[PDB]
Structures are given as C-alpha cells and as structure tokens.
Design a binder for this molecule. Sequence first.
Ligand SMILES: NCCCNc1nc(Nc2cccc(NC(=O)N3CCCC3)c2)ncc1I
Length: 277
Amino acid sequence: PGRGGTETVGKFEFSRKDLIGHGAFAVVFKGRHRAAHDLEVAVKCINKKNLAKSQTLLGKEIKILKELKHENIVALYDFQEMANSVYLVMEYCNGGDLADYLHAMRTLSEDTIRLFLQQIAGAMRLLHSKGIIHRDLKPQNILLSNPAGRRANPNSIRVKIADFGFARYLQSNMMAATLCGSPMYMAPEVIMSQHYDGKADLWSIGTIVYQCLTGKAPFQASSPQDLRLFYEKNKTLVPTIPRETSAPLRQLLLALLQRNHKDRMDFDEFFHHPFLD
Ligand SMILES: NCCCNc1nc(Nc2cccc(NC(=O)N3CCCC3)c2)ncc1I
C-alpha cells in the first residue's frame, strides 16, 4: 500500500509499487533507468515465501541468460546476486504475454502464428547451438513487445522467450532427468519420469502453437496424475485440430506433438519446415 521506498540495482531503480508478475518463485516489478526514466525495465526479485527455491531459480536464470543475447530472448541488462537476495534487471516487454493475447484475440490467424513461430525458431536455434534446454516453454513465458508507436500495426509485434529459471546446459552426449516444467506443456517423456533431451522443448513448442490456434492445451485431463496415466496408456496421441487448419500447419503440429521422442520432429526439421517460409 503506502509502504515501500525506492530500491536501486546498479543504474536502475524500482519499487514494490508496480507489480507486473507474480509466481511462487519470483515477483516482477516495473522499474526504470535512473538517468533515463523513459527506459523501462522489469526487475525480477526473490519470492521470500519460497526463499531457497526462489534463490536457486533466479541464480540459474542469471547463469543462463548472461550467456544469451538475441532479440527473441528477454535481455538481461544487469543483475545483483548476494548471499540473501537476487535481482535481475531485464528488458521490459511492452505487449504483455502470449497467453493473454491469444485469448483476447479469440485465437490467432495462421499468418500471426507464422510470424511468432519464425521468431521463436530463431531463439531456439541459439539455445540449441549453445547446448541449452529451456524446459518451461508455454504461452505464459512468451512475451510480446512492439517497437512502434501507440496503435501500431500487429505485423510489428516481436516476441521474447522468458523465464529461464528451469533451464540447464545439457551436454550433447547426455540426457536430462529432472522432473520440472508445467504439466499441460510438458513432453510425455518428462512427466513419465524418463530421460529426455532438447526434443522435450519441441513438444512444448507444439503445445504453444496448438493453443494459439484453438485457445486450449491439446490434451485435457482432470489432473496431472490423470494426464501422466493418459500418456502412459495411449501409445498413439492425436490432438483435436480444427478441420479448416492448413495442411502444412497441421503437419507441423502433428510432427511436434509426437508421443515418442524418437519419432518427434528434430531441430533441423523444425528450423527448415516450410510453414516457416
Ligand atoms: N505475466 C507477466 C510476466 C512478468 N515478466 C515480465 N513482464 C514484462 N512486461 C509486461 C507488460 C505488460 C503487462 C505485464 N503483466 C502485468 O501487468 N500483470 C500480470 C499480473 C499482474 C498484472 C508484463 N516484461 C518483462 C518481464 I521478465
């Protein structure tokens, strides 16, 4: 309410006044550059209600993001890690998140989907070449930003992958096995407690595309336990795709949403899929 004075991290300032994100493991406040007030930032802070876990995730996010520079990955301007606190000063994305946008628009046209997926593909090319897997890709973690003025055209919307707290480096001859992510967007091999690799992110991207198209996640279950049982019991998974969907987009969706990671589209195939051209 009235409590809170100005906080500073390097050349940036913020207060608890303008909350723009809240989760179990992080809180995000709008801030600004101290010498240039028109330069907006998003400052991610520990959620002290889950202090240890929050501190871990923010620390991982710094380790990963300080090594990534790309338009389609949220920028890290600066950060401040200490024994009992952690702050990240990140790019302010002025369009909100993809989850709210796809819903407000009553789902997205194929042309808009292509525009956004081309950009997501560019960021994933960098993550793949750097040997990084994100592990929590979902519309809520794809942010929008439009560089043009007020009321600018939709064709100018740029997207940025955010929230890398669950990301890790994975050596190319190894597999990951940490059960983490968000159950409705998680690859079947992850939620079934198996080893997995970068192809898990490709499943999640498939689920993003599916939700942009329909407004819903592709496999509805009554609970995460029931969803795991569903994958475990059905070796053949096929989501309900609207009949008017173009054949090339339907093909891309079905290739990404393959239950078996061996059958699923690989990175090269994704980057070069004709829907993106
Ligand atoms: N879901 C928000 C993610 C938070 N993280 C970031 N968010 C933005 N930009 C940004 C712009 C407009 C609106 C919002 N969200 C909000 O205002 N609310 C959401 C809950 C309360 C109200 C967020 N930029 C960079 C980051 I990192």
